[PDB]
Curated annotation (Swiss-Prot):
GO terms for cellular component: cell surface; extracellular region; pilus; plasma membrane; type II protein secretion system complex. Undergoes proteolytic cleavage. This is Competence protein ComGC. It is found in: Cell membrane; Cell surface; Fimbrium; Secreted. Major component of the type IV-like pilus (T4P) that plays a role in transformation. Transformation pili are dynamically extended and retracted, perhaps thereby promoting DNA uptake and transformation. Required for transformation. Required for DNA binding. Belongs to the ComGC family. Disruption phenotype: ComGD, ComGF and ComGG are undetectable. Keywords: Cell membrane, Competence, Fimbrium, Membrane, Methylation, Secreted, Signal, Transmembrane, Transmembrane helix. The keyword Transcription regulation does not apply. Induction: Up-regulated by competence-stimulating peptide (CSP). Part of the putative comGA-comGB-comGC-comGD-comGE-comGF-comGG operon.
Length: 71
């Protein structure tokens, strides 16, 4: 039951950050055409391990499992 109508020129923080990681990765599967994401976007280094690791914690909770954000 949480919605957001506000906007920001650059980013908002853990929301926009995670959101760009998820959305960016989401494509990884789209483009990539396989799966995973984090380790890979990171692999390419788009998102360093600063936010990505944070995301790894967001999804996996640092589980280390693949997919994380994709399909």
């Amino acid at each position: 039951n949480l919605t957001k109508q506000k906007e920001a020129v650059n980013d908002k923080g853990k929301a926009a950050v995670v959101k760009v990681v998820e959305s960016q990765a989401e494509l990884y599967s789209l483009e990539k055409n396989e799966d995973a994401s984090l380790r890979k976007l990171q692999a390419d280094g788009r998102i360093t391990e600063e936010q990505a690791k944070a995301y790894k914690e967001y999804h996996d909770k640092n589980g280390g499992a693949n997919r994380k954000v994709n399909d």
